[PDB]
RNA sequence: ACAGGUUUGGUCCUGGCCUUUCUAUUAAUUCUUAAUAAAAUUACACAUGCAAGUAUCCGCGCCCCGGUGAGAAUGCCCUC
C-alpha cells in the first residue's frame, strides 16, 4: 500500500472518517467464542501465509493500518484516556501478533514523547550532597605507588638461592620438570 | 520435640 | 558571602513569585482511578480542609536543589603490570550496604590494564541504580532526552514534564542535567511560555537561571501582562542582592524609590530591550487607573 | 557419591597416586609467597576479630547502653 | 538439617540458565549443598561482560569482614575475586597462571617467527 | 430484575437534595486529585453552623460479600477474568 | 458482617486501627467492671470495643475478663518482674482509658518508627532469589546485561555446543 | 461469577445436576525446524560398567552431595 512513508495519512484521509467515523476501530467488532465467558486468550494469528482465517481483528481486516510509532490517534484508541493503561487482546480482539505489536509499538511511542503518560514527582536521590569524603575525593597516593615499586615485594619474580634449588632436585628427583627463567616483562602480540 | 504416641525403642541402645 | 539558592532571602522572595494555583498543582493524573469518598463539612470545616491542602501544597513545591558542575573523579589506587593481559574485560566492585549512604560508597574499577582506580561519575551512577533500583530511573541513558526528542516534547509544550523526567534520571550535580535544565530554560525564554511553570516547583530554577544570566527582559514582560506587579517588583529586588556592584543597584540606592519605580530603574538602566519594559509597564498604569 | 560400606570398583583398584612433575625454581617462589600470604591474611583475620569483639562489647555494655537502660527506668518510676 | 560437622564457609552459588551463569556470593556450612540453605546473601557475580564490557561483582565488605572475623573460611575463586577488588592481597595461585600465560605467550611469539623465517 | 433496578434507581438520592435536608456542605475528595476538597454542592438558604456529631463506631450494616472482597478473600476463578468489551 | 450489634468492629481494619503497643515486660491484663450502674459506662464500652483492638497488637498478652466482683471497675497489669499497676476507672470515658493506658504501658512513636526501620533492612533490596525475599531472581532482569537464553537467543559463539565442536575439531 | 441451559398445559418460589474459564497426566488423530524449562507407573526383583578418595606411611573424608515419599496425623511457628 502507498502509505508507509506516512502511516498516519490514512487517519486524515477521508476513507478513515467514512467508514469508521468518530469511534474506535474495535467498536464494531465482535469476537465469536465458544460460550458465555470467552476465552482469555485470543487468536495468535488470523494472516497466515497468505490466507485470512476467518473473521479478521480490527487490524488485520484493513491492510492500509499500520502499526507503527509515528501515528498516535491510532495508538490513542488502544490506550484507556482515563486510567491510563494498555487494552487487553480480549478488550478489543485483535490478534494476540498484533497484539504483542501494539504494546511494543505504544512503549516506543512513549519512549518518543508522542504519547502522554502519568509522570510521578521523584525527590533527590541523596539527602546530602558533599563531595568531600574520600570516596569520591582522591586519596593520597601510596609511597609504593608514587616510587613505581609492586605494593608487596613477593610480586616480582626473585631468583631463588642455587642451595635451595639443589635441595628441591634432590626431593623430587625421578619426577623432576625443566625449569624457566624469570618471565618476560611485557607480552608481546601475536 | 515431643509426642504423646513415644515407643520406648530399646535396641538402639542394646547395639550401641 | 555570595548568595545561594538555600538561603531564606531568596527562598521567601520564590515562595510567593510562583504562587500557588490549587487547581493546576493538584491536577487529576492518568493512574488507575478509584470512586470518590463523600463526607459533610460545615462552613468551618471547609477552611480547615482548604489550609490542610495548602500545607499539603506547600511540602508538594519543594524546589529540586541546584548546583555547580560536579568535578571528574581520576583516582588510581594502584597499579600492578603483571596483570597486563591476564583479562580482557573490566571488574567493577561496588559496596552495597543499608546503612551506608550512596555517597560515601566506594565504586572500584579493575581495568584490563592491572590498574585499581576509582569509577568516574558516569558509571558510578549507573552502579548504584542497579543494585539500588528506585522509581523512574532506567540503567541507560532513555531515548528521550535526545536533541530530536525534546524539540518533540517542546513543541507539544511539554516543558514540565521534561523537568520532572530529567530530576528523576540524572543527579542534580551531574552534566546531563545541567544542560538539559538550561536548554529547557533557554526555549522557554524564546517561545515565552514561561505561564507553563507558574505553580510548578520547577519555577523557582528557571528564575535562578535567569538572574544569573542577566536575562530578565522576557520574564517580565509576562508577568505585567498577567497582571502580577506585586511579585514583579520582588524579581528586580532579587536581581539586585545577586548582582549589587551593578549600576542598576546604584541607582536603588542613589533614588531610593519604591513600587513600580524600581522596575523603572532597571528599565533604564541594565535592561538589554527597555522599550518595551517601559512601554508595557506604561500599559499596565493606564489600564490600571482606568479599572480603579 | 558412594557410601561408606560400598565395596570399592575394580579396575582402579591397583593405582593409588601419580602426582606431577615439580619445577624447582618455580615451586620455590610459589612456597615463598603462600607463607607471606597466609600471614598477611591472618593478620586481617585477628583483626577482624578483635573488631567482632569491640562491636558485641559495646552492644551489651557500651556507655549508650547504660543511657538507654536509665532512660526506660527512670521513665517508669 | 542436622550435619555432622563443618565449617563456615563463604563461596560461589551456580544460578541461572545454561550457557548464562551466574554466582551468588553467599555464606552457608560446608555440608549443606551449593544451592541449599544459607545464613546471609552477601553480594553477586556476573561473569558475562554487558555492553559496557564490565563484569559487575557486588560486596558485602562490612558484612564480609564479619564473617571471616568469626572464623569463616574462603574457598579459591572468592579469594581471587576479593583480591582482584583489593580487600585482599593478590592470591600466589593469581601471580603464577600470570607468569605461565607470559611465557606460553612469549613461546608462541617466538615459534611463530622462527617459521616465519 | 427489570422492576426492581427502575425501583432503586428512581429512589436514588443526589448530592443537590442530600445538601438540601442537611443545610451542610458536601464535599468530594477525589483521590486521585489528593486532599483538595472539591465541592460538588451547596446548600440553598440558611447553613447549619452546627457540626454533624461524630461517632467514633459508626453504626452501619455492612454486606459480608463486600468486606470479603476488600480483605481480599474472594479467590474465585470467575471474578477477575477478562471479558470482550462493554 | 451481617449478624452482630456492631459488625464493623470485626473487621480488619477495626482490628488494625487500633495503636496500643504494650512494653515487653507486660504479660497480664486484668479488667474488672459492672455490669449495672452508670459509672461502668466507660469500663463497658472499653471492654465492648477496644480490646479487641488492644489484644490484635498483643498476641502474647494475656486478656482475662471478671464481671461483677468488685464494686469499682478497675483495670490491674502485672509486669514481668512482679510489678503490679493498678488503673482505677469509675468516670472515664472509652476513649480516656486508651490513652491513659498508652502512657503508662505504651511505646513511644519514636520506639514504634525506628523498630520497624531496623526491620526493613532485612530485605536488602540488593540480593537476589526468589519474589517472595527478594526482588529480583536472576540476573538477566537487569537492563543492560546479557539477557535469559530462554526469552533471547544466545549467539552461536557464545554457545558451548559450538565451543566444543571446534575444540574436538 | 455479569451469569446461562433444565421441573411445569402454564406462572411465581424453593432446590439439584450440567455448560462457559485455567493448569497437569495418559490415549486417539496429526506433525517442519531451532532454543529454553521439565522429564513423573511401581519402598517390586535386578545382569554388567561406574558413582571416594586424597596424602612422604600417621591421619582426614567416605547417603556430606545425591535418591525416594514407604512410614507417621505426622506437623507449622516458637522457647530453651
Ligand atoms: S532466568 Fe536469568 S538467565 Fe534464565
Ligand atoms: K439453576
Ligand atoms: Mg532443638
Ligand atoms: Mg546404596
Ligand atoms: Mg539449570
Ligand atoms: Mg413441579
Ligand atoms: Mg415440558
Ligand atoms: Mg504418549
Ligand atoms: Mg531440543
Ligand atoms: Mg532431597
Ligand atoms: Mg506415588
Ligand atoms: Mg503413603
Ligand atoms: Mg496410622
Ligand atoms: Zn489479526
Same mark, same amino acid.
Given at each position: 500500500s502507498p502509505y508507509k512513508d506516512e502511516p498516519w495519512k490514512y487517519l486524515d484521509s477521508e476513507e478513515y472518517q467514512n467508514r469508521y467515523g468518530s469511534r474506535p476501530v474495535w467498536a464494531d467488532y465482535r469476537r465469536n467464542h465458544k460460550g458465555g465467558i470467552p476465552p482469555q486468550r485470543t487468536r495468535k494469528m488470523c494472516i497466515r501465509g497468505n490466507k485470512v482465517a476467518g473473521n479478521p481483528c480490527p487490524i488485520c481486516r484493513d491492510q492500509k493500518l499500520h502499526v507503527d510509532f509515528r501515528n498516535v490517534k491510532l495508538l490513542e484508541q488502544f490506550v484507556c484516556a482515563h486510567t491510563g493503561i494498555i487494552f487487553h487482546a480480549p478488550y478489543t480482539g485483535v490478534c494476540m501478533k498484533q497484539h504483542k505489536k501494539l504494546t511494543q509499538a505504544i512503549q516506543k511511542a512513549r519512549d518518543h514523547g508522542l504519547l502522554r503518560y502519568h509522570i510521578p514527582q521523584v525527590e533527590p536521590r541523596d539527602l546530602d550532597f558533599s563531595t568531600t569524603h574520600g570516596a569520591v575525593s582522591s586519596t593520597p597516593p601510596a609511597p609504593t605507588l608514587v616510587s613505581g615499586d609492586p605494593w608487596y615485594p613477593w610480586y616480582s619474580w626473585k631468583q631463588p638461592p642455587e642451595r635451595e634449588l639443589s635441595r628441591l632436585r634432590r626431593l623430587y628427583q625421578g619426577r623432576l620438570r625443566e625449569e624457566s627463567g624469570p618471565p618476560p616483562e611485557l607480552m608481546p602480540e601475536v | 520435640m515431643a509426642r504423646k504416641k513415644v515407643r520406648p525403642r530399646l535396641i538402639a541402645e542394646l547395639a550401641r | 558571602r555570595k548568595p545561594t539558592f538555600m538561603d531564606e532571602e531568596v527562598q521567601n522572595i520564590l515562595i510567593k513569585m510562583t504562587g500557588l494555583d490549587l487547581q493546576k498543582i493538584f491536577k487529576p493524573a492518568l493512574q488507575e482511578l478509584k470512586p470518590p469518598t463523600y463526607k459533610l463539612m460545615t462552613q468551618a470545616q471547609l477552611e480547615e480542609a482548604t489550609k490542610q491542602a495548602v500545607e499539603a501544597a506547600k511540602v508538594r513545591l519543594k524546589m529540586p536543589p541546584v548546583l555547580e558542575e560536579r568535578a571528574p573523579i581520576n583516582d588510581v589506587l594502584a597499579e600492578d603490570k603483571i596483570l597486563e593481559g591476564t583479562e580482557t574485560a573490566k571488574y567493577v566492585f561496588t559496596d552495597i550496604s543499608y546503612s551506608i549512604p550512596h555517597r560515601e560508597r566506594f565504586i572500584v574499577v579493575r581495568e584490563p590494564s592491572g590498574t585499581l582506580r576509582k569509577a568516574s561519575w558516569e558509571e558510578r551512577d549507573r552502579m548504584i541504580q542497579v543494585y539500588f533500583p528506585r522509581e523512574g530511573r532506567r540503567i541507560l541513558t532513555p531515548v528521550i532526552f535526545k536533541e530530536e526528542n525534546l524539540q518533540t516534547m517542546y513543541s507539544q509544550d511539554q516543558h514540565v514534564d521534561v523537568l520532572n523526567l530529567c530530576v528523576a534520571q540524572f543527579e542534580p550535580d551531574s552534566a546531563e542535567y545541567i544542560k538539559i535544565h538550561h536548554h529547557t530554560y533557554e526555549d522557554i525564554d524564546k517561545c515565552g511560555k514561561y505561564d507553563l511553570l507558574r505553580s510548578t516547583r520547577h519555577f523557582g530554577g528557571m528564575a535562578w537561571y535567569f538572574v544569573n544570566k542577566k536575562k530578565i527582559d522576557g520574564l517580565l514582560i509576562d508577568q505585567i501582562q498577567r497582571d502580577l506587579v506585586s511579585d514583579a517588583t520582588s524579581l528586580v529586588h532579587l536581581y539586585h542582592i545577586l548582582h549589587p556592584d551593578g549600576q542598576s543597584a546604584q541607582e536603588a540606592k542613589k533614588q531610593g524609590a519604591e !513600587?513600580?519605580?524600581?522596575? =523603572?530603574?532597571? #528599565?533604564?538602566?541594565? #535592561?538589554? =530591550? !527597555?522599550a518595551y519594559i517601559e512601554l508595557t509597564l506604561q500599559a499596565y498604569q493606564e489600564a490600571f487607573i482606568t479599572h480603579s | 557419591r558412594k557410601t561408606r560400606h560400598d565395596p570399592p570398583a575394580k579396575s582402579k583398584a591397583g593405582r593409588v597416586a601419580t602426582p606431577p612433575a615439580v619445577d624447582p625454581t618455580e615451586f620455590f617462589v610459589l612456597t615463598e609467597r603462600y607463607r607471606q600470604y597466609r600471614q598477611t591474611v591472618r593478620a586481617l583475620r585477628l583483626e577482624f576479630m578483635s573488631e567482632v569483639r569491640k562491636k558485641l562489647h559495646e552492644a551489651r555494655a557500651g556507655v549508650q547502653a547504660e543511657r538507654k537502660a536509665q532512660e526506660d527506668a527512670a521513665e517508669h518510676r | 538439617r542436622a550435619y555432622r560437622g563443618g565449617h563456615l564457609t563463604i563461596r560461589l552459588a551456580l544460578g541461572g540458565c545454561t550457557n548464562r551463569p551466574f554466582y551468588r556470593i553467599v555464606a552457608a556450612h560446608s555440608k549443606c549443598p551449593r544451592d541449599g540453605r544459607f545464613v546471609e546473601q552477601l553480594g553477586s557475580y556476573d561473569p558475562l561482560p554487558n555492553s559496557h564490557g564490565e563484569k559487575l561483582v557486588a560486596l558485602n565488605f562490612d558484612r564480609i569482614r564479619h564473617w571471616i572475623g568469626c572464623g569463616a573460611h574462603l574457598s579459591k575463586p572468592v579469594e581471587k575475586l576479593l583480591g582482584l577488588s583489593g580487600f585482599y592481597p593478590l592470591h600466589p595461585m593469581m601471580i603464577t597462571n600470570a607468569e605461565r600465560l607470559r611465557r606460553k605467550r612469549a613461546r608462541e611469539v617466538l615459534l611463530a617467527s622462527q617459521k616465519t623465517d | 430484575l427489570t422492576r426492581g433496578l427502575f425501583l432503586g434507581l428512581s429512589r436514588q438520592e443526589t448530592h443537590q437534595q442530600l445538601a438540601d435536608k442537611k443545610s451542610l456542605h458536601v464535599v468530594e475528595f477525589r483521590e486521585e486529585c489528593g486532599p483538595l476538597p472539591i465541592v460538588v454542592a451547596s446548600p440553598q438558604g440558611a447553613l447549619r453552623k452546627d457540626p454533624e456529631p461524630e461517632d467514633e463506631v459508626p453504626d452501619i450494616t455492612l454486606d459480608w460479600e463486600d468486606v470479603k472482597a476488600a480483605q481480599g478473600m474472594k479467590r474465585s476463578v470467575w471474578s477477575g477474568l477478562k471479558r470482550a468489551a462493554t | 458482617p451481617m449478624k452482630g450489634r456492631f459488625p464493623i468492629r470485626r473487621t480488619l481494619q477495626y482490628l488494625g486501627q487500633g495503636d496500643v503497643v504494650f512494653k515487653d515486660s507486660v504479660k497480664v491484663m486484668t479488667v474488672n467492671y459492672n455490669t449495672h450502674g452508670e459509672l461502668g459506662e466507660g469500663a463497658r464500652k472499653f471492654v465492648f470495643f477496644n480490646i479487641p483492638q488492644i489484644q490484635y497488637k498483643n498476641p502474647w498478652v494475656q486478656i482475662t475478663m471478671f464481671k461483677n466482683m468488685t464494686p469499682s471497675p478497675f483495670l490491674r497489669f502485672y509486669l514481668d518482674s512482679g510489678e503490679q499497676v493498678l488503673v482505677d476507672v469509675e468516670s472515664k470515658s472509652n476513649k480516656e482509658i486508651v490513652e491513659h493506658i498508652r502512657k503508662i504501658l505504651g511505646k513511644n512513636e519514636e520506639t514504634l518508627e525506628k523498630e520497624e526501620q531496623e526491620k526493613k533492612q532485612l530485605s536488602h533490596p540488593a540480593h537476589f532469589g526468589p519474589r517472595k525475599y527478594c526482588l529480583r531472581e536472576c540476573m538477566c532482569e537487569v537492563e543492560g546485561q546479557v539477557p535469559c537464553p530462554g526469552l533471547v537467543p544466545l549467539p552461536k559463539e557464545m554457545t558451548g555446543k559450538y565451543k566444543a565442536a571446534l575444540k574436538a575439531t
Amino acid at each position: 500500500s502507498p502509505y508507509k512513508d506516512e502511516p498516519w495519512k490514512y487517519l486524515d484521509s477521508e476513507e478513515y472518517q467514512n467508514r469508521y467515523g468518530s469511534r474506535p476501530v474495535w467498536a464494531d467488532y465482535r469476537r465469536n467464542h465458544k460460550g458465555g465467558i470467552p476465552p482469555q486468550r485470543t487468536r495468535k494469528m488470523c494472516i497466515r501465509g497468505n490466507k485470512v482465517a476467518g473473521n479478521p481483528c480490527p487490524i488485520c481486516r484493513d491492510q492500509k493500518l499500520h502499526v507503527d510509532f509515528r501515528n498516535v490517534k491510532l495508538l490513542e484508541q488502544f490506550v484507556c484516556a482515563h486510567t491510563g493503561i494498555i487494552f487487553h487482546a480480549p478488550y478489543t480482539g485483535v490478534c494476540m501478533k498484533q497484539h504483542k505489536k501494539l504494546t511494543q509499538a505504544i512503549q516506543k511511542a512513549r519512549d518518543h514523547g508522542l504519547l502522554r503518560y502519568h509522570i510521578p514527582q521523584v525527590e533527590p536521590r541523596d539527602l546530602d550532597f558533599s563531595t568531600t569524603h574520600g570516596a569520591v575525593s582522591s586519596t593520597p597516593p601510596a609511597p609504593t605507588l608514587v616510587s613505581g615499586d609492586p605494593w608487596y615485594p613477593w610480586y616480582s619474580w626473585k631468583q631463588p638461592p642455587e642451595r635451595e634449588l639443589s635441595r628441591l632436585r634432590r626431593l623430587y628427583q625421578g619426577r623432576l620438570r625443566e625449569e624457566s627463567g624469570p618471565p618476560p616483562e611485557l607480552m608481546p602480540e601475536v | 520435640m515431643a509426642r504423646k504416641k513415644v515407643r520406648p525403642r530399646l535396641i538402639a541402645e542394646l547395639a550401641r | 558571602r555570595k548568595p545561594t539558592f538555600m538561603d531564606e532571602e531568596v527562598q521567601n522572595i520564590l515562595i510567593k513569585m510562583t504562587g500557588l494555583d490549587l487547581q493546576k498543582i493538584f491536577k487529576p493524573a492518568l493512574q488507575e482511578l478509584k470512586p470518590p469518598t463523600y463526607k459533610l463539612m460545615t462552613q468551618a470545616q471547609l477552611e480547615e480542609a482548604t489550609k490542610q491542602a495548602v500545607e499539603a501544597a506547600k511540602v508538594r513545591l519543594k524546589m529540586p536543589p541546584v548546583l555547580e558542575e560536579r568535578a571528574p573523579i581520576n583516582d588510581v589506587l594502584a597499579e600492578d603490570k603483571i596483570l597486563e593481559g591476564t583479562e580482557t574485560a573490566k571488574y567493577v566492585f561496588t559496596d552495597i550496604s543499608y546503612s551506608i549512604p550512596h555517597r560515601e560508597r566506594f565504586i572500584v574499577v579493575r581495568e584490563p590494564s592491572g590498574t585499581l582506580r576509582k569509577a568516574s561519575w558516569e558509571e558510578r551512577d549507573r552502579m548504584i541504580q542497579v543494585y539500588f533500583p528506585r522509581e523512574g530511573r532506567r540503567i541507560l541513558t532513555p531515548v528521550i532526552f535526545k536533541e530530536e526528542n525534546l524539540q518533540t516534547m517542546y513543541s507539544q509544550d511539554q516543558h514540565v514534564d521534561v523537568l520532572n523526567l530529567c530530576v528523576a534520571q540524572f543527579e542534580p550535580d551531574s552534566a546531563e542535567y545541567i544542560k538539559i535544565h538550561h536548554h529547557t530554560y533557554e526555549d522557554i525564554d524564546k517561545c515565552g511560555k514561561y505561564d507553563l511553570l507558574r505553580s510548578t516547583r520547577h519555577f523557582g530554577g528557571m528564575a535562578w537561571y535567569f538572574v544569573n544570566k542577566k536575562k530578565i527582559d522576557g520574564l517580565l514582560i509576562d508577568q505585567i501582562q498577567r497582571d502580577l506587579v506585586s511579585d514583579a517588583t520582588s524579581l528586580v529586588h532579587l536581581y539586585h542582592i545577586l548582582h549589587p556592584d551593578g549600576q542598576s543597584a546604584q541607582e536603588a540606592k542613589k533614588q531610593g524609590a519604591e !513600587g513600580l519605580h524600581l522596575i =523603572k530603574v532597571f #528599565a533604564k538602566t541594565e #535592561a538589554q =530591550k !527597555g522599550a518595551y519594559i517601559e512601554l508595557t509597564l506604561q500599559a499596565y498604569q493606564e489600564a490600571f487607573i482606568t479599572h480603579s | 557419591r558412594k557410601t561408606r560400606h560400598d565395596p570399592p570398583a575394580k579396575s582402579k583398584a591397583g593405582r593409588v597416586a601419580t602426582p606431577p612433575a615439580v619445577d624447582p625454581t618455580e615451586f620455590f617462589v610459589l612456597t615463598e609467597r603462600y607463607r607471606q600470604y597466609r600471614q598477611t591474611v591472618r593478620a586481617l583475620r585477628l583483626e577482624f576479630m578483635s573488631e567482632v569483639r569491640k562491636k558485641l562489647h559495646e552492644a551489651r555494655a557500651g556507655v549508650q547502653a547504660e543511657r538507654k537502660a536509665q532512660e526506660d527506668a527512670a521513665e517508669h518510676r | 538439617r542436622a550435619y555432622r560437622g563443618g565449617h563456615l564457609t563463604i563461596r560461589l552459588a551456580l544460578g541461572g540458565c545454561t550457557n548464562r551463569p551466574f554466582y551468588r556470593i553467599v555464606a552457608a556450612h560446608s555440608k549443606c549443598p551449593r544451592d541449599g540453605r544459607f545464613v546471609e546473601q552477601l553480594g553477586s557475580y556476573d561473569p558475562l561482560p554487558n555492553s559496557h564490557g564490565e563484569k559487575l561483582v557486588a560486596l558485602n565488605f562490612d558484612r564480609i569482614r564479619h564473617w571471616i572475623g568469626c572464623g569463616a573460611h574462603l574457598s579459591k575463586p572468592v579469594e581471587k575475586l576479593l583480591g582482584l577488588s583489593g580487600f585482599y592481597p593478590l592470591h600466589p595461585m593469581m601471580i603464577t597462571n600470570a607468569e605461565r600465560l607470559r611465557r606460553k605467550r612469549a613461546r608462541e611469539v617466538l615459534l611463530a617467527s622462527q617459521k616465519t623465517d | 430484575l427489570t422492576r426492581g433496578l427502575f425501583l432503586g434507581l428512581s429512589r436514588q438520592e443526589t448530592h443537590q437534595q442530600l445538601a438540601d435536608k442537611k443545610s451542610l456542605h458536601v464535599v468530594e475528595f477525589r483521590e486521585e486529585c489528593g486532599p483538595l476538597p472539591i465541592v460538588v454542592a451547596s446548600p440553598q438558604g440558611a447553613l447549619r453552623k452546627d457540626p454533624e456529631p461524630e461517632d467514633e463506631v459508626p453504626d452501619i450494616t455492612l454486606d459480608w460479600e463486600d468486606v470479603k472482597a476488600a480483605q481480599g478473600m474472594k479467590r474465585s476463578v470467575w471474578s477477575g477474568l477478562k471479558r470482550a468489551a462493554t | 458482617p451481617m449478624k452482630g450489634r456492631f459488625p464493623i468492629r470485626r473487621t480488619l481494619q477495626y482490628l488494625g486501627q487500633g495503636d496500643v503497643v504494650f512494653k515487653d515486660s507486660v504479660k497480664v491484663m486484668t479488667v474488672n467492671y459492672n455490669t449495672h450502674g452508670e459509672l461502668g459506662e466507660g469500663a463497658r464500652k472499653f471492654v465492648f470495643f477496644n480490646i479487641p483492638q488492644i489484644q490484635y497488637k498483643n498476641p502474647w498478652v494475656q486478656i482475662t475478663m471478671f464481671k461483677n466482683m468488685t464494686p469499682s471497675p478497675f483495670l490491674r497489669f502485672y509486669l514481668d518482674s512482679g510489678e503490679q499497676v493498678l488503673v482505677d476507672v469509675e468516670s472515664k470515658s472509652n476513649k480516656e482509658i486508651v490513652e491513659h493506658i498508652r502512657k503508662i504501658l505504651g511505646k513511644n512513636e519514636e520506639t514504634l518508627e525506628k523498630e520497624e526501620q531496623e526491620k526493613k533492612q532485612l530485605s536488602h533490596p540488593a540480593h537476589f532469589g526468589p519474589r517472595k525475599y527478594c526482588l529480583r531472581e536472576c540476573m538477566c532482569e537487569v537492563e543492560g546485561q546479557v539477557p535469559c537464553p530462554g526469552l533471547v537467543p544466545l549467539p552461536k559463539e557464545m554457545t558451548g555446543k559450538y565451543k566444543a565442536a571446534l575444540k574436538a575439531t
